[PDB]
Amino acid sequence: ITAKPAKTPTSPKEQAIGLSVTFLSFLLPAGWVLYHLDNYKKS
Amino acid sequence: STALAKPQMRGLLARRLRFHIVGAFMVSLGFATFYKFAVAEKRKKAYADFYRNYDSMKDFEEMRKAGIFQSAK
Amino acid sequence: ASGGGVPTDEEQATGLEREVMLAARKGQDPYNILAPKATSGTKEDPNLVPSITNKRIVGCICEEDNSTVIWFWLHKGEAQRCPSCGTHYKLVPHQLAH
Amino acid sequence: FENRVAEKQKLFQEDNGLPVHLKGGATDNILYRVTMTLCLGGTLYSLYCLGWASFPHK
Amino acid sequence: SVVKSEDYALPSYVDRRDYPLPDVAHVKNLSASQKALKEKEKASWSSLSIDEKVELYRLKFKESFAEMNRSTNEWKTVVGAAMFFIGFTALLLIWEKHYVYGPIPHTFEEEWVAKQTKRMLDMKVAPIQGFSAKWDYDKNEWKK
Amino acid sequence: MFINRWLFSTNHKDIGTLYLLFGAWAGMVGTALSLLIRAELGQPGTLLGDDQIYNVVVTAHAFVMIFFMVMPIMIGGFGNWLVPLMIGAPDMAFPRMNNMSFWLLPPSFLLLLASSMVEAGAGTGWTVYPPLAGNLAHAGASVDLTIFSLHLAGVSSILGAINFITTIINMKPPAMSQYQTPLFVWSVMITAVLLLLSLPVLAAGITMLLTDRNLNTTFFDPAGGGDPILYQHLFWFFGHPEVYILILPGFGMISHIVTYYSGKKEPFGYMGMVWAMMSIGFLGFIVWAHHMFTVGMDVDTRAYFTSATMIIAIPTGVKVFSWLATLHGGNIKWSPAMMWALGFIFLFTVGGLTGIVLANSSLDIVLHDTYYVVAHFHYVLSMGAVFAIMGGFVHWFPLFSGYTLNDTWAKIHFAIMFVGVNMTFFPQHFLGLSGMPRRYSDYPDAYTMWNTISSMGSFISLTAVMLMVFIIWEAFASKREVLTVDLTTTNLEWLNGCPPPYHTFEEPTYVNLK
Amino acid sequence: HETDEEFDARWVTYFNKPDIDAWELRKGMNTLVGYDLVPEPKIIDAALRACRRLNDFASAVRILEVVKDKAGPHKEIYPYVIQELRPTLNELGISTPEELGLDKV
Amino acid sequence: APDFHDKYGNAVLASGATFCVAVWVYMATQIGIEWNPSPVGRVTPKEWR
Amino acid sequence: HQTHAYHMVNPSPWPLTGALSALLMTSGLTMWFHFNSMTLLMIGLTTNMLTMYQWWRDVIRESTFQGHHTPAVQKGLRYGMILFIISEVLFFTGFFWAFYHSSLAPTPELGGCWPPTGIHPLNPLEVPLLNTSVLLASGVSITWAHHSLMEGDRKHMLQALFITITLGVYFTLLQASEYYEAPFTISDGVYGSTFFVATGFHGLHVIIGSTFLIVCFFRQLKFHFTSNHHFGFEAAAWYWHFVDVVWLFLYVSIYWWGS
Amino acid sequence: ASAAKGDHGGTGARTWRFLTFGLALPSVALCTLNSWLHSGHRERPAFIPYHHLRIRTKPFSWGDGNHTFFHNPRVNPLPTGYEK
Amino acid sequence: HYEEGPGKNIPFSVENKWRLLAMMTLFFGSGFAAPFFIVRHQLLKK
Amino acid sequence: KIKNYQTAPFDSRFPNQNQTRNCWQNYLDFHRCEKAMTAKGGDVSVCEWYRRVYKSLCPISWVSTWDDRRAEGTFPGKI
Amino acid sequence: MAYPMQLGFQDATSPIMEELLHFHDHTLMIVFLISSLVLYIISLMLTTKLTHTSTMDAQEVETIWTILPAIILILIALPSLRILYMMDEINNPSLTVKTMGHQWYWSYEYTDYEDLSFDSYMIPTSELKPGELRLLEVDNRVVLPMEMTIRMLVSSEDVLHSWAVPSLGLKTDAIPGRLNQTTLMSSRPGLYYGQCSEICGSNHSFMPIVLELVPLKYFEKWSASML
Numbered sequence A: 001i002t003a004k005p006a007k008t009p010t011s012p013k014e015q016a017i018g019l020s021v022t023f024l025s026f027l028l029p030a031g032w033v034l035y036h037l038d039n040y041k042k043s
Numbered sequence B: 001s002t003a004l005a006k007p008q009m010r011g012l013l014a015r016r017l018r019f020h021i022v023g024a025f026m027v028s029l030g031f032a033t034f035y036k037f038a039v040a041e042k043r044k045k046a047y048a049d050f051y052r053n054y055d056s057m058k059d060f061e062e063m064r065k066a067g068i069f070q071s072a073k
Numbered sequence C: 001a002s003g004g005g006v007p008t009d010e011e012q013a014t015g016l017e018r019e020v021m022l023a024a025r026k027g028q029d030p031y032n033i034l035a036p037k038a039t040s041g042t043k044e045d046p047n048l049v050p051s052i053t054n055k056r057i058v059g060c061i062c063e064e065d066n067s068t069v070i071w072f073w074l075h076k077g078e079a080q081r082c083p084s085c086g087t088h089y090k091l092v093p094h095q096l097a098h
Numbered sequence D: 001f002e003n004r005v006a007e008k009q010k011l012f013q014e015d016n017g018l019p020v021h022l023k024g025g026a027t028d029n030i031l032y033r034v035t036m037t038l039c040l041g042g043t044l045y046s047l048y049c050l051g052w053a054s055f056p057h058k
Numbered sequence E: 001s002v003v004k005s006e007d008y009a010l011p012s013y014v015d016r017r018d019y020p021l022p023d024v025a026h027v028k029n030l031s032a033s034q035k036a037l038k039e040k041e042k043a044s045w046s047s048l049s050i051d052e053k054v055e056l057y058r059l060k061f062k063e064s065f066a067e068m069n070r071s072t073n074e075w076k077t078v079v080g081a082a083m084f085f086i087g088f089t090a091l092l093l094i095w096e097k098h099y100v101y102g103p104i105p106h107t108f109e110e111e112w113v114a115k116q117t118k119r120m121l122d123m124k125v126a127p128i129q130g131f132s133a134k135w136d137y138d139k140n141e142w143k144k
Numbered sequence F: 001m002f003i004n005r006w007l008f009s010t011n012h013k014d015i016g017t018l019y020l021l022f023g024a025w026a027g028m029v030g031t032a033l034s035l036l037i038r039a040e041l042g043q044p045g046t047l048l049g050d051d052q053i054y055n056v057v058v059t060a061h062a063f064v065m066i067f068f069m070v071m072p073i074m075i076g077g078f079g080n081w082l083v084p085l086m087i088g089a090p091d092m093a094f095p096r097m098n099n100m101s102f103w104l105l106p107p108s109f110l111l112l113l114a115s116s117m118v119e120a121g122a123g124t125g126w127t128v129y130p131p132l133a134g135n136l137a138h139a140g141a142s143v144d145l146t147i148f149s150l151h152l153a154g155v156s157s158i159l160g161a162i163n164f165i166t167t168i169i170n171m172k173p174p175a176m177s178q179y180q181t182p183l184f185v186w187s188v189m190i191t192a193v194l195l196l197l198s199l200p201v202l203a204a205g206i207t208m209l210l211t212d213r214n215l216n217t218t219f220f221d222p223a224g225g226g227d228p229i230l231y232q233h234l235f236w237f238f239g240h241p242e243v244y245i246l247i248l249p250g251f252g253m254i255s256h257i258v259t260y261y262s263g264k265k266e267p268f269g270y271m272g273m274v275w276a277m278m279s280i281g282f283l284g285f286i287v288w289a290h291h292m293f294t295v296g297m298d299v300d301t302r303a304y305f306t307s308a309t310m311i312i313a314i315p316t317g318v319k320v321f322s323w324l325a326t327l328h329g330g331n332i333k334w335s336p337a338m339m340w341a342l343g344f345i346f347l348f349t350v351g352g353l354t355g356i357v358l359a360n361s362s363l364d365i366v367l368h369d370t371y372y373v374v375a376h377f378h379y380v381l382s383m384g385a386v387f388a389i390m391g392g393f394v395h396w397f398p399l400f401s402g403y404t405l406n407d408t409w410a411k412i413h414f415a416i417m418f419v420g421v422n423m424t425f426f427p428q429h430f431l432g433l434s435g436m437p438r439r440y441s442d443y444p445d446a447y448t449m450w451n452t453i454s455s456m457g458s459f460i461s462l463t464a465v466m467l468m469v470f471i472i473w474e475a476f477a478s479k480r481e482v483l484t485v486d487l488t489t490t491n492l493e494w495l496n497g498c499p500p501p502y503h504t505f506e507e508p509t510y511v512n513l514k
Numbered sequence G: 001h002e003t004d005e006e007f008d009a010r011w012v013t014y015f016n017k018p019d020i021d022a023w024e025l026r027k028g029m030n031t032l033v034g035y036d037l038v039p040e041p042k043i044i045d046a047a048l049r050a051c052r053r054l055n056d057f058a059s060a061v062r063i064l065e066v067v068k069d070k071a072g073p074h075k076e077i078y079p080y081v082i083q084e085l086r087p088t089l090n091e092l093g094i095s096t097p098e099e100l101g102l103d104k105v
Numbered sequence H: 001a002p003d004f005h006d007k008y009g010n011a012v013l014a015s016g017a018t019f020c021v022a023v024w025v026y027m028a029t030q031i032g033i034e035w036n037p038s039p040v041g042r043v044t045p046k047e048w049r
Numbered sequence I: 001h002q003t004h005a006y007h008m009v010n011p012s013p014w015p016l017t018g019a020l021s022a023l024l025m026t027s028g029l030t031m032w033f034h035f036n037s038m039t040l041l042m043i044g045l046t047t048n049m050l051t052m053y054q055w056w057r058d059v060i061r062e063s064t065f066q067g068h069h070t071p072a073v074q075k076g077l078r079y080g081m082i083l084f085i086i087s088e089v090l091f092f093t094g095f096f097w098a099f100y101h102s103s104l105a106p107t108p109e110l111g112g113c114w115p116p117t118g119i120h121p122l123n124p125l126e127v128p129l130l131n132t133s134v135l136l137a138s139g140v141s142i143t144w145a146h147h148s149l150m151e152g153d154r155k156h157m158l159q160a161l162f163i164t165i166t167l168g169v170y171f172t173l174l175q176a177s178e179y180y181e182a183p184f185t186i187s188d189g190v191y192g193s194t195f196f197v198a199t200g201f202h203g204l205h206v207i208i209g210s211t212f213l214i215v216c217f218f219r220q221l222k223f224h225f226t227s228n229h230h231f232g233f234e235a236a237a238w239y240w241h242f243v244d245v246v247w248l249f250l251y252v253s254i255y256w257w258g259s
Numbered sequence J: 001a002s003a004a005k006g007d008h009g010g011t012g013a014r015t016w017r018f019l020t021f022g023l024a025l026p027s028v029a030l031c032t033l034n035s036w037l038h039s040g041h042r043e044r045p046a047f048i049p050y051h052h053l054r055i056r057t058k059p060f061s062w063g064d065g066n067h068t069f070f071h072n073p074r075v076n077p078l079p080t081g082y083e084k
Numbered sequence K: 001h002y003e004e005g006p007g008k009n010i011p012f013s014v015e016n017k018w019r020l021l022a023m024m025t026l027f028f029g030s031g032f033a034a035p036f037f038i039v040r041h042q043l044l045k046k
Numbered sequence L: 001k002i003k004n005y006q007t008a009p010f011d012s013r014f015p016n017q018n019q020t021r022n023c024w025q026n027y028l029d030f031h032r033c034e035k036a037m038t039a040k041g042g043d044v045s046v047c048e049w050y051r052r053v054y055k056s057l058c059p060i061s062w063v064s065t066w067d068d069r070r071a072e073g074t075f076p077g078k079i
Numbered sequence M: 001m002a003y004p005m006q007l008g009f010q011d012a013t014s015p016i017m018e019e020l021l022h023f024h025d026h027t028l029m030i031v032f033l034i035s036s037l038v039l040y041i042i043s044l045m046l047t048t049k050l051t052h053t054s055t056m057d058a059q060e061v062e063t064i065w066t067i068l069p070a071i072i073l074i075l076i077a078l079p080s081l082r083i084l085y086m087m088d089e090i091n092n093p094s095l096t097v098k099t100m101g102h103q104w105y106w107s108y109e110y111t112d113y114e115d116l117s118f119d120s121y122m123i124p125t126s127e128l129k130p131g132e133l134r135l136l137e138v139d140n141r142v143v144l145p146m147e148m149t150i151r152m153l154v155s156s157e158d159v160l161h162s163w164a165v166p167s168l169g170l171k172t173d174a175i176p177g178r179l180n181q182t183t184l185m186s187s188r189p190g191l192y193y194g195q196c197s198e199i200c201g202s203n204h205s206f207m208p209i210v211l212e213l214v215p216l217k218y219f220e221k222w223s224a225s226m227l
């Protein structure tokens, strides 16, 4: 396939930001829950 | 210098296919021979050799003396 | 035993249903219900492809019972050829439904 | 009864840009509004009932 | 030169080694001198210079076969980045073992395991091949 | 306008888009449940609780992955987007009923979430066998909310099947016979027949479970003369066709991908592929009791279900070899989508072969309700249905959106996922053969090493799933607009540009009869 | 079905048609390279002379490139074909891709 | 012109490889995971009764 | 402007309201079963009827009043209805499988026999035979209705269709009386379970089919059907023959052979 | 079979009306005769608390939880016997 | 009519990539987070 | 009168994995035989074989429930 | 029992389980060979620049790749079904033992002669004696005579369970209202473990099975002592 160059290029820095935000959005709430499992169980 | 000889120019892909499928077939027979000797027959002989002179009462008495049983001390 | 009182399609069909009905009576197929029959497809005798715009997708079944259909846009102008079998197609643009 | 289909065909073919479910007139809009209000209202209430049934009542 | 979105229904250029002669020329608009070059192409090609021949090729085609078939270093990026994210995953596993997992049962303590091993051997667990078969009941040691 | 367009749609592309968004969200839900499973099992002992919370998680994992992720993506998503384009149709036969098929799924998913929030959830297995699932051992609303969740998903798919069958039979160009429609179109139609015939039987069985639970019927209760094994027959009468429903659209997408990235105009042996998909669909209805080899059935019955299950390898093998023959002589393009399809061919073949091991009732005595089964079905679902989804998504993402993915990121994504799924599931064969049961929150100590590796694998798949979200974001963020696509003469769905207009084929294609 | 000799003759005849047009030239070469063979010199010779009648130098060079490509790893075929075409290449003024530097990546 | 892979390929490969090995070896040996390997050839059996 | 014959439907709210009505009915049943309350359920049943009413109203507007049902569109509706009926056959098939499974292998709790100890089946020669003659007769009258419509005879269409509907109502009233008079109940083991669930879903389908016939009756009164274009009537007739054939299978299997 | 009628000159409204009034409805009228004739109540059987009958694993969601939906006092005993 | 073309045939905006990132994060993040919070809800009952 | 009973032998009427009807039939046969003998002025010892078989095969809780129901008047089998 | 890092089946304790081992070896060789062949052919198709993209005739090769799989299937089904019917054969048991599944433990009934029955519960991890196996030991083992044919009868008094002993090749579902039959014959004395093999609620993972195989005289005295 052929395509145009990006209309709004995403530089390496922007990509590191989108990658970091994306991972944190999965990792932090589940991490919070698993971290506090004991509190939930032996509540 | 000298002219180059005319090489084979037709059916090159089909020729490669034929040659490697026969090679796959001869490897497949070689592996089945290995497998039948390293796994299947090995297992048949381990079981046969184990039970050939197996003494189940002697086996039991060893277990009994080691203390493993609820019903037999 | 048998009076009337039920309308017919001729009396009461409307909209596109009626347009299809009336065109069929004239032997016409403006809404593409039938498969067109091929010509010989030469440059002199090309398959004539009606359209209401200046391009139409053709699918070419190059040989009878091919499962593969060859698709391409046919444009207003000089006849074009199927990229697989070469048979000729020519667009004939027109006016208000086919 | 008389056959009045032609009048309904004129009404529903009128070039007023209305979608078919509103093309009969203001009574369509009322019926639409009653239906969607009951559906959306009832859905919020089902969420309230889920939230209630999600916790023990000793 | 410039390909537009609004051109999708028109015959288009492609460099594909299995489609050597595409449906259109790479360059359709010609300068004054490129026009003169196309006229000279109608006479003997022996009178074309090397540069004129390369230019005629570059009007018709975008990339040559050697160019379009070239290999790349992309595999290095792919394999290295994959190993990075696999390495990242171990950080998640480190975190999980530190903050989520508690102690494992006492049956994995070294002395428990040694006694369980003796007991498994006393009951002759898998004596034909799998476990006790690998113990030498005469020399009181694991078989070599 | 926004409400008109996205809540009131009668457009096959927009509805297809709704299904892809819904399935993607469900896939996040199913992934989290899969990680909770493997966190529980990743070290010996108890992490979350006893088997009740654990099997609520297992049950939801299965329902979400099957009914809210694979089926909506393959059938609702790819089927709605591609089927009308691939036959030159202006939309589906029933464009407004099509929209209700979609809008029944968020309610269905809400009922499943509700079931896990009330009481102690439905800790039943996705098979929902009684008496565990009846009103004494699972008192309260959770199991009934599960049953109603299934009823809505079942209505959604039955109406969808009717819509797909009618569209594919009735809305091709008049010159196009059924034997000139692409293989993906065939795979959807055959999938739709299977849905039509199988889901009403599921619906009858779960309805009988509902009435045993709430109206004092005793279909499955021996005190009234009923039979727990009757439920198992009715469920698997649906449940075996359901796994062919889960793979057939995948087979069709694989045929198209392998043909495309081999640079071929057509798959090898088209009529053989049609024959094979129909044969699989038919044999898929006469083999259900191979899910019941340990229930106490007569030996002749076991012998029949053994042999009829094994014969399905023959048409399936024709498809695998025909894919290999499509590669043969191709101008191979090593695109990310081609990697998914190649992984599919090999890893679906492995899981199909362990299915054949399991078809032998004698051996299945020992393998049944062990992780050997879990390994089999994740080779064909995590490395089969899912690989065809990922291959299809990367290949057609530019058609649906008008934008290109970054191919290097997509290859990185493939490599990570490939390592993670094999690390996850390959060791489960050993756990199976050595006796580890299904649906255990904890295991005897000896099983520790393979469970530890298997859970580490599941974390690698997690990293791939997260990376996938970033890759989709990078595509929409950079806005690289498609220009030219190769091979449009044999891939009609690309011929209206990227993305195609809202209305396509307003003027139908021209195809003559000759 | 037909002999190798009948195949080649059908293809030599195809390209020798005096008034072959540009579409027919492209269709012939694009179809030909689908086959499991590298085309005989006498076929390429006829295609090159069709290029000449069509005043298309560039497609002549491209046809030589595709001969090389169709040979795959068999590095001996292309220099043999070029050897055999040299009198035609000289008579027509057709430079090879290598003589034009178009074999450089 | 040299693309991203010409410029940074060697370094991504080398660094990804080295980081991946180091962190998995660390996770596998240094944080108390119980692999539960075979006792064969490793454990001295001890009286239990 | 299109130049194919298929129907592009205006964007509609009823898929959404039908789907929410399904949520409200199923969560309503849950609340009724487990939280002693009928409110959600009645809301769902109301929105469900509203949805059906407006949706099929619109289909009539689109066809009779707007003319979108070309022959190609009609052919599609034909397939759709056939496929819908096939799905309903397979639904009943699961209940017949349950019935045969339990009655062909009666368990010790039943006395090891069928009919179970303590069950006194209805006499299949009394009201069940009457029900059979009724539905069979309605199959004959609906066919007379069909032929009258094709021959353009408005009065005899209406008369035959009215006779058909009266018979459907008769069946329903007879069945409701038999339910009340039956000495066994749905809680009487697997006999009562299979009996009332299978005949109960059949009776629901009789009520749906009768409603569909009544819709055709009022549409006929308003001259909607032509002598050649009347697919709603054909669909209602196909559905009516399906309800008839299911009865015959129930009669032979459960009332007669299972007695 | 051929039943034992005949006709088949063609298929028409008139023939199906003939069948409706000359065969179908007279059949209904005859079975209506047969049924409402063998009508009348029959002696309800002795009550035996069989454990496979009068099942109650959960209260019914109406009434007092112990009555079936179309409970008939004359012929439907409760788990504890007939109503009084 | 409706808007046609890249970025316009979808129920969410891609006009600003950072707002897109936030929308996609909430969308996929809420799906992934939900089972952890349901597990927590169930443990916090009993 | 043929004893050295060890356990219930293979019975060709019940050759399959599901043995429920084997237990049930021998339970009925024993209690039918006992009723015949108790009445007609005979001795239940002729019923012994059925009693051995059903005791061997039948779960304790099945016998105990069936016994309770015969006592109550609610046993659905014919004896 | 299973041992750490185990790859395959537990060693066979009965002739039938020994048959299954050899049949699995036979089937696994075919699985390896077909899997390997597919992997190899894939790699072959992908490793040449030679092309051939015109239409390919199929019907010739489709004979091969329908016939050879059919033969392979017959070569599996033949030993498969021989074992199936061999397992079904009449045997004349010396002893009948019943097991009833419960939430969450097994009871056993030996009622050929006396009314002997008892409950069998997992040993809790806090009460294991050193050397004992976590989640697998029970308080009251299922003592049985070795080298003898035993009829096991399996049912349940609540939900489904399934009664399994991998090294004897045994798995029989425990269904309420149903009495399922299997046969058991151990070639050796010793201790043989299994686990509940149908999901059955909160303690599904924790209701194991332990058979204790001993000579007939020990079994008889144990039985008398359990009255």
Ligand code: HEA
Binding pocket: F127, F243, F244, F246, F247, F290, F291, F309, F310, F312, F313, F314, F316, F317, F318, F320, F348, F349, F350, F351, F352, F353, F354, F355, F356, F358, F359, F360, F364, F367, F368, F369, F373, F376, F377, F380, F381, F384, F385, M034, M038, M068, M069, M070, M072, M073
């Ligand atoms: C997409 C899903 C999918 C697919 C496609 C399949 C495909 C098959 N499955 Fe599987 N299966 C499941 C999903 C799937 N399965 C699930 C979810 C379960 C468990 C359900 C539960 O309990 O929850 C399961 C359970 C299951 C069981 C029950 C085991 C048990 O519970 O004890 C069995 C038994 O026969 C079985 C067999 C098969 C077979 C023979 C195929 C065949 O279709 C495979 C055919 C393919 C090949 C054989 C490979 C290609 C062929 C060749 C290359 C030709 C040459 C090959 C030979 C000559 C053999 N499956």
Ligand SMILES: CCCCC/C=C\C/C=C/C/C=C\C/C=C\CCCC(=O)O[C@H](COC(=O)CCCCCCCCCCCCCCCCC)COP(=O)(O)OCCN
Binding pocket: F151, F152, F154, F155, F200, F203, F207, F211, F215, I029, I172, I175, I176, I179, I180, I181, I182, I183, I184, I185, I186, I187, I196, I197, I199, I200, I201, I203, I204, J068, J069, J070, J071, J072, J076
């Ligand atoms: C007049 C002739 C026809 C009568 C119809 C009366 C109402 C029935 C409506 C039809 C529904 C059919 C099946 C529902 C299940 C049971 C109803 C069986 C028919 C019936 O009405 O059975 C009655 C019991 O009703 C009961 O329990 C109460 C039942 C009320 C609640 C119904 C429960 C919910 C239904 C679930 C629907 C799921 C639908 C399928 C979705 C599939 C998606 C693919 C029998 O009365 P009885 O007093 O026990 O004995 C008579 C003694 N003199």
Ligand SMILES: CCCCC/C=C/C/C=C/CCCCCCCC(=O)O[C@H](COC(=O)CCCCCCCCCCCCCCC)COP(=O)(O)OCC[N+](C)(C)C
Binding pocket: B010, B011, B017, B021, F321, F324, F325, F328, G001, G002, G003, G004, G007, G035, G036, G037, M034, M041, M055, M056, M057, M058, M060, M061, M064, M065, M068, M069
């Ligand atoms: C479980 C165990 C299963 C094991 C399965 C093992 C599979 C073994 C497969 C072996 C395949 C052998 C196939 C032989 C087919 C021969 C067809 C033929 O004979 O070739 C042609 C027909 O072509 C055509 O359909 C197109 C040519 C190819 C047609 C057949 C291609 C099949 C390719 C398969 C590739 C391997 C994929 C499957 C591997 C399992 C005719 O060619 P010509 O030279 O005349 O034309 C060239 C023109 N000239 C020469 C005149 C210049």
Ligand SMILES: CCCCCC/C=C/CCCCCCCCCC(=O)O[C@H](COC(=O)CCCCCCCCCCCCCCC)COP(=O)(O)OC[C@@H](O)CO
Binding pocket: C012, C013, I052, I056, I057, I059, I060, I063, I064, I069, I077, I204, I207, I208, I209, I211, I212, I215, I224, I225, I226, I229, I230, I231, I232, I233, I235, I239
């Ligand atoms: C106690 C009850 C509780 C549950 C509620 C059930 C309520 C009953 C609803 C009964 C069904 C009524 C259906 C009315 C349909 C009217 C619309 C219609 O019939 O529309 C026709 C098209 O057919 C079409 O869509 C036909 C589409 C109709 C399919 C309907 C089939 C029945 C489905 C009902 C749901 C069953 C659920 C069963 C439980 C599992 C219009 O085309 P024509 O007739 O050719 O006219 C055109 C001519 O005028 C031109 O000259």
Ligand SMILES: CCCCCCCCCCO[C@@H]1O[C@H](CO)[C@@H](O[C@H]2O[C@H](CO)[C@@H](O)[C@H](O)[C@H]2O)[C@H](O)[C@H]1O
Binding pocket: A027, A028, A029, A030, A031, A032, A034, A035, E092, E095, E096, E099, F035, F036, F039
């Ligand atoms: C299966 C999917 C999950 C894979 C593993 C996830 C990787 C974890 C990501 C980090 O998650 C965070 O971890 C912190 C710990 O590192 C937690 O802070 C907790 O710990 C901190 C340090 O003890 C305290 O400062 C905080 O207040 C306390 O919330 C925090 O809540 C949680 O969001």
Ligand code: CUA
Binding pocket: M101, M102, M104, M160, M161, M162, M196, M197, M198, M199, M200, M201, M203, M204, M205, M207
């Ligand atoms: Cu008992 Cu699982």
Ligand SMILES: [O-][O-]
Binding pocket: F239, F240, F243
């Ligand atoms: O189901 O395989």
Ligand SMILES: [Cu+2]
Binding pocket: F239, F240, F243, F287, F288, F290, F291
């Ligand atoms: Cu199956």
Ligand SMILES: [Mg+2]
Binding pocket: F294, F368, F369, M162, M197, M198
């Ligand atoms: Mg099981």
Ligand code: NA
Binding pocket: F040, F041, F042, F043, F044, F045, F046, F047, F441, F442, F443
């Ligand atoms: Na655990």
Ligand code: NA
Binding pocket: I146, I230, I233, I234
């Ligand atoms: Na009609």
Ligand SMILES: [Zn+2]
Binding pocket: C060, C061, C062, C063, C070, C082, C083, C084, C085, C086, C087
């Ligand atoms: Zn063509």
